[PDB]
Paper text:
The active ingredient of Bti is a parasporal body that contains three natural sub-micron-sized crystals of four highly efficient mosquito-specific toxins, namely Cyt1Aa, Cry11Aa and co-crystallizing Cry4Aa and Cry4Ba. Following ingestion by mosquito larvae, the crystals promptly dissolve in the alkaline environment of the gut (pH ~11), releasing protoxins that are activated into toxins through proteolytic cleavage of propeptides by gut enzymes. Each activated protein eventually self-assembles into cytolytic oligomers that perforate gut cells, leading to mosquito larvae death. Here, we use serial femtosecond crystallography (SFX) at an X-ray free electron laser (XFEL) to identify the features governing the in vivo crystallization of Cyt1Aa in Bti cells, and to track the structural dynamics driving natural crystal dissolution in the alkaline mosquito larvae gut.
Residue numbers in the entry:
A (entry chain BBB), B (entry chain BBB): 6 to 249
């Protein structure tokens, strides 16, 4: 049943990941959290830590101006404020408040522009360790919005016949070989104006074309690792509920 | 600053969810898990339970036939077998092994056909409580494949000039008001033949058109709830690593 061939090693062929992906949708949390929590972890003993950082940066969400609409977005300035109050004491490594704009380009181009900004915040090493989740997360900021439209991290502002305003709040927690003894926390507040009506925006794909004016606010926060292996699960449950 | 208007109550306007969403990507788990774990929970004390069910149904994954390609898929038959060995003892409520086919239709139609099958497995009540995650999950089975292409739950089979074969493995754990004293576990193994080359499949959207022959294998498993609030986090870490 079929002679065994000598190995032809293709060094560019990407091997299948061994990473385990678990998504939690927690109905009716005690306290509301309006940040999509995306966690890239190699040691589950740092999950609680990751969740607590998301709990902290919920307080850095601010309302948009009335002209934009009735929405919440992560504020870099308020983020810095909040950062200094977090225990255990960490360090703000970087922060950005930058506008991004394109005219009559594919949504895929916009995604790339935003990725560029976030990769600058993360850095090469950090970027590389989370590239799949980061790419997905940014993709899901501009597309796949129908299933997300009523979720806690996205807010619809003013909706004209030519334009849709909406905010999108995502937080990345990273702990792996590229981070060492700290966990990086990167909250992102998107303020997005797009040149389509909401009904079209809801079904936008990477192929669609549109003009965007987008403000990106983010910081990168390094907190020394604290394992939670010895605490009861009740404490994790509490962290998730935001009551810890 | 602007007279307060009497309330105009629109009873169809869907309110924003309060649900908290947390995604974990666990790099280098001790034991490999090839099921995308999607958890709809109202009490985080049942997370460990949810993860342990995913650990169990990893053993119900079987290789496809050589004609299809080198892929793993959840097997309903092997699932039933595995079900009977799970402790604490639960009950197989339903199971399906059904082919789904369409000709020259939009991908959105295929998604709807698959949703129909999975909703039949779940039932009205259960379906309704997880509709967003279920819709997203099925959408992500047929689209958004580029960021997923190297992940642990998707396997690429034979790839011709006219057809692409791939498997997709997703597990839903549900615990809320619609489940009561049990948690429902619904693993799904997709075996998908699509009439496009891989390069196109990778960037398929809901708008694209294609022909599909798809086999869906799933069961619905009810396990009585066991809270884990009093165990150490180490046990959750262990469950995630599949060493518990
Ligand atoms: Na939906
Ligand atoms: Na990618």
């Amino acid at each position: 049943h079929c002679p065994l061939e000598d190995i032809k090693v293709n060094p560019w062929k990407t091997p299948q990941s061994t990473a385990r992906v678990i998504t939690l949708r927690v109905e009716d949390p005690n306290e509301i959290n309006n940040l999509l929590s995306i966690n890239e972890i190699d040691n589950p003993n740092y999950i609680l830590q990751a969740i607590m950082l998301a709990n902290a940066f919920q307080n850095a969400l601010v309302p948009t101006s009335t002209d934009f609409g009735d929405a919440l977005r992560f504020s870099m300035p308020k983020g810095l404020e909040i950062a200094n109050t977090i225990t255990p004491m960490g360090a703000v490594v970087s922060y950005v408040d930058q506008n991004v704009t394109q005219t009559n380009n594919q949504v895929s181009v916009m995604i790339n522009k935003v990725l560029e900004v976030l990769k600058t915040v993360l850095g090469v090493a950090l970027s590389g360790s989370v590239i799949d989740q980061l790419t997905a997360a940014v993709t899901n900021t501009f597309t796949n919005l129908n299933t997300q439209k009523n979720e806690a991290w996205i807010f619809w502002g003013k909706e004209t016949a030519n334009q849709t305003n909406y905010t999108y709040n995502v937080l990345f927690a990273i702990q792996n070989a590229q981070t060492g003894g700290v966990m990086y926390c990167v909250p992102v507040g998107f303020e997005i104006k797009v040149s389509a009506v909401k009904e079209q925006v809801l079904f936008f794909t990477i192929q669609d074309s549109a003009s965007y004016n987008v403000n990106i606010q983010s910081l990168k926060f390094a907190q020394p690792l604290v394992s939670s292996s010895q605490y009861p699960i009740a404490d994790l449950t509490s962290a998730i509920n935001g009551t810890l």
